[PDB]
RNA sequence: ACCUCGAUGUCGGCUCGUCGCAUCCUGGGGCUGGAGCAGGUCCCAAGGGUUGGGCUGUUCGCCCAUUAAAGCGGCACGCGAGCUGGGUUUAGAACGUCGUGAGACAGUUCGGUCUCUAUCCGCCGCGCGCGUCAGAAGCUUGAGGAAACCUGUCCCUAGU
RNA sequence: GAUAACCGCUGAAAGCAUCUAAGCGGGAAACCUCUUCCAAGACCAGGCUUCUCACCCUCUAGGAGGGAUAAGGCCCCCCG
């Protein structure tokens, strides 16, 4: 009703470029195209915020509107200020390096694990045990961050492996 | 005596149906009607007095529900365990015209006349067909109201 | 993208490697092949090169084949066979009238050799499918080489397609894969391919580059 | 039914309208008209449509 | 994963959800992870 | 007690299969009641493979040596117009028990005829004839099918 | 390539919101391509070449019925 109809504050340096129900928002960081679903349209609400409204109100339009406003906000935020996921590696011998456009991990495997940075994704290693993913599409940023997480099967014993900036993993201690 | 088609009084007409965003079953029903010739007052069930039915944009047929992944087209090769199943989505991706073809053929009668009638169906997985020389009539599927 | 050459299975022999190990090698006359026709996706819908091999007499060659070879611009040859290629650059490599010699292959190159296997005639189930023969003694009545049971009973009620029965065996296309070319005798237009290749001595074979161990 | 739908009317409503109009032509001769006299069949279709109620689905 | 016809919370942390047309129990304790089948 | 008593052949073994998944490898979740590790219990996802012997009528089993494993079932407890005939169930005989006896015995034993040239469907292979819009000819070209798909140790990684 | 279990989205029809809701994106031997073989009787029968690009006769001079054939192929013959 209101929490899905919240106007999305569009910053000064943005050109959303509608052509019906298919937006292509451009800003300081890249461009992002979104094929909006059935319910809503867009008229900028004059002030600049993309208006988000649903025609009817049963259940499907309700959910699609709630998600469409949310995705529009996420997209404008990503194109304006981007998104970053900071991640940390634990375990004696576990390490990460940045080999140009790819990220290499030593996670106790006999081989170094290589990760090719996909389009729109950039890795930055703050320390041999701390790095971060950055991108304008946080769906993709979170997806690649999840891949980096799943690199190592969960270690509830020692905590060895990759995590996020702050994560209290399901630790596990007991007998000898 | 009731009218019976004699010699060459069976006149044939060419229709082209745009399968874009149309329900597979509805399109197949209309096409089967046209291919039978049930739309003609001269229809005789033992005569192939139907009409040629080109189907364009067969790849852009519409299927509701989960038929695109949960419905299967089956074929047994005659060998043990030789039942190959291909979902409607995979079939539409690999042989797009085959979904519409199978629908129409199944809706047609299964007999010698049915297989003769099949030859008048021309399904194409695109907006265009090679039969422009036949001057096909754009056929929109319209329901007669009561 | 995949070399190939029509040849003749001259025979089989043995050579010795640098380590003195014996290499059983089929000697195949990968004689000159003349590119007679190029198959293109525009004209033919696929990418292939038509090769012609073997000396034949023009009197032997018939008018349709003679005219096809004339249009190709080359002298008629006994056999013609197509080599399929993946992409169009593969045929852009080839050209009609081209000379294909055994040197297209190198020593140590893995090839797939296709040939028509030897004719074994109407073979029984034991020879044809490796059926375990029934007992030679202990009562066995005239079933020492017979198939045994063929189906079930009433429930299938019939014999399944593909039931391995006795019939004519051999004379079928066989592609032996990943055969190493021990040596490429450029002087004689010959290839020494380690191992056996299908068919009788003198039979037409196609030595293509290994599809797996490229 | 083919002739009726060519005339933009269903067979069931055509029969209803003919009965309302009092046309007692059997289906044999209705089909004979449909094939040999499409103009006459269209005239009968018009008669049936006129005789049909203002709303065929009305509770009447 | 506990795949049983009946799935219920085993502690106050367990939550019953319906994901992919399937009743499941999700919990901070993986032991209490259940699924209906 | 519904087909079959103007006959639908039994157990086992052989031969040849084919199918199901109710999993003996390949993927996961939980336990980490492994705090951990080598391992293992449990529950979710058929392509292949799933040995040879001895004692067993042996349908069952047990044993020996292996195995990655030595799966469970359906198909007339698949398969005798494909085989065997050890079991079983004729006619001979012995013993045991019952019976006056003839004889009887889900009692112990020895011996004890396995017929048929395939018409139809089915299947495995070969042709002949027509098609395939002129009469031929090489090269094909994949709609659709079939085949295959198994898995071990040892070494390095790492005595991590 | 598509698929159980594991996830990502800003975070709602729903409030610090929340694995996820409806929508949309990523990770086995089974499945579809891939490998081998058959395959246009694939009744929906491809790019080329060969003759010709009608030789003659008869009822009709419509539609046919026969010869000769160009092209090529059987049958014979020597054979594997
Ligand atoms: C060589 C020449 C004979 O072959 C045999 O002896 C075979 C070897 C018998 O099996 C032998 C061996 C064996 C085990 O075979 C089944 C045995 O049961 C019979 C009694 O004797 C057969 C086939 C018997 O049939 C079987 O009889 C059973 C009572 C039932 C069975 N079926 C209906 C269920 C039926 O087919 C039976 C009675 O002889 C059939 C009748 C017609 C005959 O008499 C005919 C004339 C036979 O003499 C014969 C075919 O010429």
mmCIF file of C-alpha atoms in Angstrom, chain E residues 5-36:
data_model
loop_
_atom_site.group_PDB
_atom_site.id
_atom_site.type_symbol
_atom_site.label_atom_id
_atom_site.label_comp_id
_atom_site.label_asym_id
_atom_site.label_seq_id
_atom_site.Cartn_x
_atom_site.Cartn_y
_atom_site.Cartn_z
ATOM 1 C CA UNK E 5 5.750 -37.026 5.946
ATOM 2 C CA UNK E 6 5.430 -34.947 9.127
ATOM 3 C CA UNK E 7 7.747 -31.995 9.747
ATOM 4 C CA UNK E 8 7.353 -29.825 12.838
ATOM 5 C CA UNK E 9 9.513 -27.396 14.822
ATOM 6 C CA UNK E 10 11.787 -29.261 17.211
ATOM 7 C CA UNK E 11 12.798 -26.115 19.121
ATOM 8 C CA UNK E 12 11.643 -22.513 19.386
ATOM 9 C CA UNK E 13 14.208 -21.563 16.725
ATOM 10 C CA UNK E 14 12.723 -23.839 14.055
ATOM 11 C CA UNK E 15 10.480 -22.169 11.480
ATOM 12 C CA UNK E 16 8.053 -23.987 9.190
ATOM 13 C CA UNK E 17 8.162 -22.659 5.624
ATOM 14 C CA UNK E 18 6.734 -23.819 2.301
ATOM 15 C CA UNK E 19 9.373 -23.607 -0.432
ATOM 16 C CA UNK E 20 8.859 -25.051 -3.918
ATOM 17 C CA UNK E 21 5.480 -26.505 -3.001
ATOM 18 C CA UNK E 22 7.076 -28.401 -0.130
ATOM 19 C CA UNK E 23 6.726 -27.943 3.618
ATOM 20 C CA UNK E 24 10.132 -27.732 5.281
ATOM 21 C CA UNK E 25 11.577 -26.754 8.647
ATOM 22 C CA UNK E 26 14.514 -24.328 8.671
ATOM 23 C CA UNK E 27 16.523 -23.793 11.837
ATOM 24 C CA UNK E 28 19.797 -22.374 13.071
ATOM 25 C CA UNK E 29 20.418 -25.968 14.176
ATOM 26 C CA UNK E 30 20.970 -28.026 10.998
ATOM 27 C CA UNK E 31 19.988 -31.159 12.914
ATOM 28 C CA UNK E 32 16.415 -29.803 12.989
ATOM 29 C CA UNK E 33 16.377 -29.234 9.214
ATOM 30 C CA UNK E 34 13.354 -31.161 7.922
ATOM 31 C CA UNK E 35 11.475 -31.678 4.671
ATOM 32 C CA UNK E 36 8.176 -33.281 3.697
#
